[PDB]
């Protein structure tokens, strides 16, 4: 039933390394059986029930079973389970390629479109056919078999390379060693740190270590070495992968009839073509140039003063290892924001509480934590999501907030169960997992403001994953265009820059006292600080991502150095290879990194024109946003759903206004 919880979360995290391996094989046998059954049907015998519905039903059964196998590589504390989960993921990816490239299926899906009365079948059923046929042409099923078999070889290679690329970065354990004097101006961070022989400390290259050093450490030489180590992670092994991966992407795109990989991938996005991306990025890059110059000039003066005051040598430039440091000093001077003070007001429990209350109230939902929930780690917690008005049970979400050995290093959201229809006719309960890495509680976990913003960001995907209700699994949850998928996440970040919202999220960890109104005004005002260089940095990464996928006789590190010089104005350091660490290139954002900035235009347009106009906690606007932007999922195009919400096509006005500008 759609109003209950019992037995709707099919997932289990008990699985041994042997259980995964055998379930992988069992799942392939079960799933292939359906594809064989549809393939054996004669061309005349094909109908909605025996072809379209058969494939749609096995997609639900497959994707659910698959997450029990492919998800434990990111969260299981057992290393042998992670290896089996990874190997299952490689195998099932090779299985996906085989099933996607079935010529007999494609032949029967095409025939079902021409003959069937498309008006008498639902809009989302027409969409399933339109996309299945489109994917068939994108897999080259119209081409000759010898060309298909070549495309198949390269796609199985490309899959393993992509998985290897990001696993190398996850498995990395590189560390440098420094003394107390060398880690100067870092807070008593130093105590939560491992000692070696010679009274020296171990610094990992993980985000909780790297960024505090680059932001706070006042010895230039240790920032320099940390930055060198960070931008050479997996340099040899991941340069080798990129040198294979990018030409293969080009060669496959050429065989499918596209000039480049970027053209191939842009067709499935709301931006449509690479010409619109290039114009979007170049136009925005031009508007930020004056801010970038102004901010580069203040940082450089500030460096000359600090080099004078401390008596260091002054090289007359901003190095990559100076940028985050003097951007932090810029915030402290111009907005009086000490991040290590301010985090005392954001204990993890008060932020979690505030976050969950905000979006219960806004989206008209009710959350309840489940006691003695079945989880993959003791510290992970489960919640059930209800509609409040009807009491309909929409979904569940796991929260996995604290770091450990073997866990995924960065912030992410995973769809575990789709919110789709079953053969039964009932709604499947949506399930999601929020995976982030904040410190853990003898002092409680204190979140920096960007950690709260990351928390809010990722919970936008959780809400998108759960509120989405579609007929078919492939359109469910967050399965939207990649340059649209960051709309729901980036819009919720706006609630972390509002004064009243921030007061609800904050409380001092000892006193219980609120953040002073003065400092609360300055925090909201500091949204604009360093915005030129932060946005120019994102433009560089977007431009590089495009450039690497538009011609593959460029050196990737050179191309990165080029845009760092021309756009950002801060040079990449000789010997580094930032692209070799650029895990978005292998994690389904290939030729699609512009998507962040592209969707931010839409998120800001929605926030200013509708939420900020009629009050940001208004349940009627929040229900509209839920119904028109979250609920449809991938069952509608991104720009149609924007049109339904905004009552018009979007524009940059609000987004431009968010940065300053005009």
């Amino acid at each position: 039933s759609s109003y209950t919880v019992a037995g709707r979360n099919v997932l289990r995290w008990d699985l041994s390394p042997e259980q995964i391996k055998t379930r992988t094989e069992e799942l392939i046998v079960q799933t292939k059986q359906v594809y064989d059954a549809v393939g054996m049907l004669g061309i005349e015998e094909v109908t909605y029930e025996n072809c379209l519905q058969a494939l749609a039903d096995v997609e639900v059964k497959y994707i659910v079973e698959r997450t029990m196998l492919d998800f434990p590589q990111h969260v299981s504390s057992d290393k042998e389970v992670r290896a089996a989960s990874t190997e299952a993921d490689k195998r099932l990816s090779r299985f996906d390629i085989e099933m996607s490239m079935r010529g007999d299926i494609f032949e029967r899906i095409v025939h079902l479109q021409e003959t069937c009365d498309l008006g008498k079948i639902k809009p989302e059923a027409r969409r399933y056919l339109e996309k299945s046929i489109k994917m068939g042409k994108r897999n080259g099923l119209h081409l000759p078999e010898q060309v298909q078999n070549e495309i198949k070889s390269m796609k199985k290679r490309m899959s393993e390379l992509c998985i290897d690329f990001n696993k190398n970065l996850n498995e990395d354990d590189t560390f440098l060693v420094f003394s107390k004097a060398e880690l100067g101006a870092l807070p008593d961070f130093i105590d939560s740190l491992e000692k070696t022989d010679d009274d020296k400390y171990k610094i990992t290259l993980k985000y909780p270590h790297y960024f505090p050093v680059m932001k706070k450490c006042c010895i230039p030489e240790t920032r320099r070495r940390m930055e060198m180590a960070f931008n050479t992670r997996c340099k040899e092994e991941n340069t080798i992968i990129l040198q294979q991966l990018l030409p293969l992407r080009t060669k496959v795109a050429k065989l499918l009839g596209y000039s480049t990989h970027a053209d191939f991938v842009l067709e499935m996005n709301t931006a449509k073509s690479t010409s619109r991306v290039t114009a979007f990025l170049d136009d925005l890059s031009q508007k930020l140039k004056p801010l970038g110059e102004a901010e580069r000039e203040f940082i450089l003066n500030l460096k000359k003063k600090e080099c004078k005051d401390r008596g260091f040598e002054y090289d007359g430039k901003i190095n990559a290892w100076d940028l985050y440091y003097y951007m932090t000093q810029t915030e402290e001077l111009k907005y009086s924001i000490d991040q290590e003070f301010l985090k005392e007001y954001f204990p993890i429990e008060v932020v979690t509480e505030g976050l969950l209350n905000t979006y219960q109230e806004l989206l008209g939902l009710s959350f309840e934590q489940m006691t003695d929930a079945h989880v993959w780690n003791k510290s992970v917690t489960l919640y059930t999501v209800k509609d409040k008005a009807t009491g309909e049970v929409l979904g569940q979400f796991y929260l996995d907030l604290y770091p450990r050995e073997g866990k995924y290093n960065h912030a992410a959201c995973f769809g575990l169960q789709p919110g789709c229809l079953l053969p039964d006719g009932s709604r499947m309960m949506a399930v999601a997992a929020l995976v982030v890495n904040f410190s853990q509680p003898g002092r409680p976990s204190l979140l920096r403001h960007d950690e709260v913003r990351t928390y809010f960001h990722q919970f936008g995907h959780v809400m998108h994953q759960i509120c989405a209700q579609t007929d078919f699994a492939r359109f469910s949850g967050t399965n939207v265009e990649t340059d649209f998928v960051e709309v729901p996440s980036q819009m919720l970040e706006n609630w972390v820059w509002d004064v009243d919202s921030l007061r609800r999220l904050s409380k001092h960890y000892k006193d219980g006292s609120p953040i002073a109104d003065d400092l609360l005004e300055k925090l909201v005002a500091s949204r604009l600080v360093n915005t030129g260089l932060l946005t120019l940095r994102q433009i560089v990464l977007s431009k590089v991502d495009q450039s690497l996928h538009t011609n593959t006789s460029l050196d990737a590190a050179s191309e990165y150095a080029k845009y760092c010089s021309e756009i950002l104005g801060v040079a990449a350091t000789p010997g580094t290879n930032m692209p070799a660490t650029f895990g978005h290139l292998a994690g389904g954002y290939d030729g699609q990194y512009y998507g962040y900035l592209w969707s931010e235009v839409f998120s800001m347009d929605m926030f200013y024109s509708c939420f900020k106009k009629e009050g940001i906690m208004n349940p009627e606007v929040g229900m509209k946003y839920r119904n028109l932007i979250l609920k449809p999922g991938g069952s509608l195009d991104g720009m149609d759903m924007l049109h339904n919400f905004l009552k018009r096509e979007p524009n940059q006005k609000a987004f431009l206004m968010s940065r300053g500008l005009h």
Binding site: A411, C413, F414, G415, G587, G588
Partner: peptide
């Protein structure tokens, strides 16, 4: 797959 995954959403960061």
């Amino acid at each position: 797959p995954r959403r960061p």
